[PDB]
Amino acid sequence: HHMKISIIGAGSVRFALQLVGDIAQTEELSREDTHIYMMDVHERRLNASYILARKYVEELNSPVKIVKTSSLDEAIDGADFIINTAYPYDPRYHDSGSQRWDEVTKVGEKHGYYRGIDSQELNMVSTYTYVLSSYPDMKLALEIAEKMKKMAPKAYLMQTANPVFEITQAVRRWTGANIVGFCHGVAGVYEVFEKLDLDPEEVDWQVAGVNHGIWLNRFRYRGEDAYPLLDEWIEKKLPEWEPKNPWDTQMSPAAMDMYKFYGMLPIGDTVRNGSWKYHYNLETKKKWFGKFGGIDNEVERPKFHEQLRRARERLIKLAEEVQQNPGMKLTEEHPEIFPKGKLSGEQHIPFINAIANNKRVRLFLNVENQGTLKDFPDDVVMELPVWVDCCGIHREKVEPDLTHRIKIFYLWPRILRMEWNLEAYISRDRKVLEEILIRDPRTKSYEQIVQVLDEIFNLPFNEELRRYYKE
Amino acid sequence: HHMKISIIGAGSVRFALQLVGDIAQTEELSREDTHIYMMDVHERRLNASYILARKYVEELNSPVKIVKTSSLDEAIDGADFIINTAYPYDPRYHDSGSQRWDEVTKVGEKHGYYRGIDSQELNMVSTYTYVLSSYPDMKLALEIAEKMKKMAPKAYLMQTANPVFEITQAVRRWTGANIVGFCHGVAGVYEVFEKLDLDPEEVDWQVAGVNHGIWLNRFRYRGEDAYPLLDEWIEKKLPEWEPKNPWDTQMSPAAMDMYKFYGMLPIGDTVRNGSWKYHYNLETKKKWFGKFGGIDNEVERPKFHEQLRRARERLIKLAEEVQQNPGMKLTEEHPEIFPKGKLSGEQHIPFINAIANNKRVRLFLNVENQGTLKDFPDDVVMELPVWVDCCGIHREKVEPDLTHRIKIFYLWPRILRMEWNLEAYISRDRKVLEEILIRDPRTKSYEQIVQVLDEIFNLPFNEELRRYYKE
Numbered sequence: 001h002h003m004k005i006s007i008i009g010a011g012s013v014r015f016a017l018q019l020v021g022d023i024a025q026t027e028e029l030s031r032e033d034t035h036i037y038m039m040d041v042h043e044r045r046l047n048a049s050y051i052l053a054r055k056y057v058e059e060l061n062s063p064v065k066i067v068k069t070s071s072l073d074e075a076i077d078g079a080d081f082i083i084n085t086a087y088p089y090d091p092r093y094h095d096s097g098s099q100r101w102d103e104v105t106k107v108g109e110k111h112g113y114y115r116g117i118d119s120q121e122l123n124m125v126s127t128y129t130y131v132l133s134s135y136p137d138m139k140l141a142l143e144i145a146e147k148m149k150k151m152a153p154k155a156y157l158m159q160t161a162n163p164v165f166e167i168t169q170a171v172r173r174w175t176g177a178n179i180v181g182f183c184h185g186v187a188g189v190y191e192v193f194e195k196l197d198l199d200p201e202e203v204d205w206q207v208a209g210v211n212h213g214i215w216l217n218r219f220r221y222r223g224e225d226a227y228p229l230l231d232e233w234i235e236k237k238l239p240e241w242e243p244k245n246p247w248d249t250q251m252s253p254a255a256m257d258m259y260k261f262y263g264m265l266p267i268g269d270t271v272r273n274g275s276w277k278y279h280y281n282l283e284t285k286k287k288w289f290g291k292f293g294g295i296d297n298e299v300e301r302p303k304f305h306e307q308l309r310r311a312r313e314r315l316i317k318l319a320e321e322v323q324q325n326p327g328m329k330l331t332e333e334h335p336e337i338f339p340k341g342k343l344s345g346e347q348h349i350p351f352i353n354a355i356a357n358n359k360r361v362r363l364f365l366n367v368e369n370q371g372t373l374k375d376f377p378d379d380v381v382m383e384l385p386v387w388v389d390c391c392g393i394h395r396e397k398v399e400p401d402l403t404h405r406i407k408i409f410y411l412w413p414r415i416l417r418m419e420w421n422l423e424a425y426i427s428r429d430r431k432v433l434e435e436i437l438i439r440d441p442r443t444k445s446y447e448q449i450v451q452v453l454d455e456i457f458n459l460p461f462n463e464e465l466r467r468y469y470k471e
Numbered sequence: 472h473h474m475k476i477s478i479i480g481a482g483s484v485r486f487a488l489q490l491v492g493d494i495a496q497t498e499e500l501s502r503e504d505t506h507i508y509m510m511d512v513h514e515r516r517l518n519a520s521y522i523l524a525r526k527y528v529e530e531l532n533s534p535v536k537i538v539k540t541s542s543l544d545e546a547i548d549g550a551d552f553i554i555n556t557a558y559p560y561d562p563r564y565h566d567s568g569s570q571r572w573d574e575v576t577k578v579g580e581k582h583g584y585y586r587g588i589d590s591q592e593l594n595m596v597s598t599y600t601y602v603l604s605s606y607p608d609m610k611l612a613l614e615i616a617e618k619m620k621k622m623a624p625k626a627y628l629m630q631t632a633n634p635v636f637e638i639t640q641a642v643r644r645w646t647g648a649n650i651v652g653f654c655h656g657v658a659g660v661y662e663v664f665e666k667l668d669l670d671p672e673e674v675d676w677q678v679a680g681v682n683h684g685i686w687l688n689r690f691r692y693r694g695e696d697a698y699p700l701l702d703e704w705i706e707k708k709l710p711e712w713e714p715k716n717p718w719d720t721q722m723s724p725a726a727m728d729m730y731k732f733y734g735m736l737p738i739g740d741t742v743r744n745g746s747w748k749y750h751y752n753l754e755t756k757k758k759w760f761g762k763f764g765g766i767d768n769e770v771e772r773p774k775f776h777e778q779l780r781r782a783r784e785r786l787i788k789l790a791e792e793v794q795q796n797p798g799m800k801l802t803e804e805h806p807e808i809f810p811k812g813k814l815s816g817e818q819h820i821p822f823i824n825a826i827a828n829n830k831r832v833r834l835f836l837n838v839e840n841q842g843t844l845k846d847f848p849d850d851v852v853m854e855l856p857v858w859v860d861c862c863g864i865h866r867e868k869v870e871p872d873l874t875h876r877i878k879i880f881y882l883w884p885r886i887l888r889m890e891w892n893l894e895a896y897i898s899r900d901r902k903v904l905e906e907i908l909i910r911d912p913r914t915k916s917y918e919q920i921v922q923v924l925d926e927i928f929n930l931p932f933n934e935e936l937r938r939y940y941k942e
Contacts, residue, residue, distance in 0.1 A: 260902075261906065375848075404894065412883070412887055413887065416879055416884065416887075419879040420880070431732055435732065439746065439747075440912070444751075
């Protein structure tokens with residue numbers, strides 16, 4: 001047979017471009033019998049990705065076949081791998097998923113919720129959830145899961161869209177579907193090693209926890225705990241640390257503070273998901289994250305979404321250029337965006353090449369605990385270090401165990417917040433949403449949460465959201 | 472041999488009087504070979520309880536022997552049953568345990584924490600915890616547990632002092648000691664049956680959960696769910712409900728609201744331990760609990776502690792009366808306080824008579840889950856329906872199971888808050904206390920929690936508390 005890899009939401013041009021780049025440069029997958037289905041509902045973006053992708057593989061000399069489609073059934077039918085990177089929205093009001101999150105966040109601030117209703121303790125990550133329930137995004141992943149159990153029973157559903165923890169769990173639990181959560185927050189660990197003058201391949205390390213809630217449980221050098229090297233860095237170097245850009249938080253005072261308390265270093269976006277201690281306002285964010293106040297604020301987030309929008313428009317306009325200039329080479333003209341002989345460092349293609357062609361590799365994926373961390377249920381989805389080959393996912397033993405304080409102060413509260421979000425969705429009940437905000441540290445009255453929720457629900461692009469929560 | 476029942480903190484005159492009344496009226500325990508050791512550190516109160524108790528049993532014609540002691544070793548040595556009803560304090564500053572709680576609560580309000588630092592979501596119960604850790608009270612129960620493993624290895628430690636959940640758990644886990652938590656919040660259920668015109672002995676019922684967090688999981692009449700009778704009462708009767716006194720909350724709008732959301736009626740002090748929805752201020756408390764705003768407020772609690780103080784002074788002065796008037800009969804002069812031919816309805820003596828003399832009885836006690844509620848760990852202490860005989864405690868099957876919403880919204884959050892409180896104690900670390908308040912919905916800044924904690928720690932009667940948390 002051939003191999004079908006469907007990318008749902010392929011209008012995310014850059015992420016799709018790095019996926020297509022990775023498969024086209026992977027010797028075992030770069031075959032005539034590899035078919036990439038790019039599927040999306042917004043056609044301007046779709047057509048751009050498609051012509052760019054085709055131009056790109058042409059220049060890598062990859063015989064991979066690329067098929068654009070407009071219908072999700074045709075993309076799912078008989079697929080071997082389904083990558084969901086879709087960010088749903090209503091084209092009558094918006095032109096991008098992030099616009100809707102940006103707007104409910106303004107309504108949330110209007111009613112006294114700084115950084116919006118979706119900014120909660122232990123998840124400050126922007127655009128992670130959408131009105132707690134994430135209805136638009138969860139609805140789509142469950143639609144995909146119902147369609148694929150009929151037309152693609154042997155496929156792996158690779159969840160990339162947020163919230164990955166909530167969605168992966170819901171699909172896993174409510175459908176049978178073979179879903180796996182992907183996220184690459186694990187990469188920040190390489191910055192820790194460099195800042196401590198450590199050859200990365202000479203470090204024995206491990207992380208574990210929950211999506212955007214992972215901890216460096218094992219950090220060793222020469223068979224000895226290397227955490228004293230971090231304690232020394234905190235003494236000497238931290239006083240003069242400074243971020244390169246609003247995303248640079250791994251070695252921040254907020255991270256070191258969380259390290260002091262929990263006993264292990266929080267990795268990647270975990271650092272963004274601290275307690276309210278670091279997030280009361282912009283001035284407080286700047287004390288703990290440096291001059292930008294990190295990425296999750298009034299100034300840097302709208303700035304970032306504006307850059308992202310600006311970039312879509314460009315890639316569309318670039319697609320009109322390759323149409324207009326058949327002869328120009330994308331590898332030469334924009335090598336940043338079309339790398340030759342390098343890999344994205346994303347885990348998606350390594351995963352596919354492992355399962356399809358037995359190229360065994362260590363990955364960090366969101367899968368059911370299944371008794372890897374004993375103090376938590378077997379069915380709860382977690383970000384774990386796993387080995388992947390043609391027999392599927394195999395979990396590494398997690399050693400040392402995560403500290404008591406991580407379990408009771410971080411992980412368990414975060415698991416419950418997920419259980420809260422899933423109950424809100426499944427029950428179709430406003431009361432659950434109200435109860436979530438009743439426990440929000442910035443709720444002043446009950447009247448307040450009723451009025452925020454009302455206003456959010458009455459935004460024109462949430463018409464079907466409020467019809468979902470209608471008595 | 473004889474039987475030794477030690478009451479630690481016997482200066483709680485009224486509670487001690489009802490204990491001594493219950494044993495003296497229990498046919499199997501009212502023996503010459505039953506010895507009651509009353510022990511306390513404050514001698515004015517001790518002497519009063521002792522002479523009152525002796526006068527009391529004299530009039531019931533109970534041959535029970537009563538021994539006052541000043542030393543806790545002498546009370547614990549060779550004891551069969553040890554009832555801990557002590558509320559520690561410093562006599563150089565205070566004359567009662569509740570004075571210290573009242574004062575840290577004033578300091579908490581001073582710094583913007585309404586009803587004090589110890590009033591947290593899912594525990595509004597006044598005087599339950601003391602500066603989160605409850606150091607004075609936990610220290611004493613662990614001292615008792617270390618002394619009794621040497622001098623009373625076969626004894627049952629009956630915890631009555633608060634916090635019962637935290638203390639019972641800590642002792643259980645950190646020592647071997649055979650501890651069991653007692654609390655009689657289960658009694659409110661009899662008011663529910665009466666208000667619905669139900670013969671109480673014709674109702675098939677059960678409760679379960681956590682101390683001050685119990686739910687009416689089973690409510691049946693004629694082998695049929697009787698919860699529609701509660702739904703009818705809510706329609707017709709609730710609009711005209713009104714409390715008899717600040718403790719009357721079982722049928723309140725707050726209780727019915729919690730019933731609507733969780734699916735089961737919260738029982739006793741559970742009703743006091745709702746979310747902040749019902750507790751923002753006095754005016755909001757009065758909407759949900761009636762004209763008094765319940766018992767946990769600025770007005771009714773100091774009023775209640777003043778009545779309690781007034782009552783101690785009286786019982787002391789009554790003791791000087793029986794000394795002065797040998798001939799007067801306490802049964803006749805104050806029958807409210809010295810009942811003849813009735814039982815307290817407290818579970819303490821039924822328990823003793825069950826274990827000692829095989830008078831089997833159904834009780835609701837705080838013991839280790841041990842897989843009674845499957846979704847929770849085996850070692851966590853919980854308030855469960857149990858049968859008690861001479862072979863010990865036997866747990867009833869809990870059926871139906873508690874609802875999903877109770878588990879994820881009420882019980883699990885409350886278990887974690889306990890785990891937080893125990894970590895604060897065991898670690899001797901202010902940072903844990905800070906982290907608890909970092910998640911308090913009325914914390915505005917980190918500076919705020921540092922200043923509350925500082926001021927609390929610097930109150931003269933907390934000298935040894937702050938030396939316990941000293942760097």
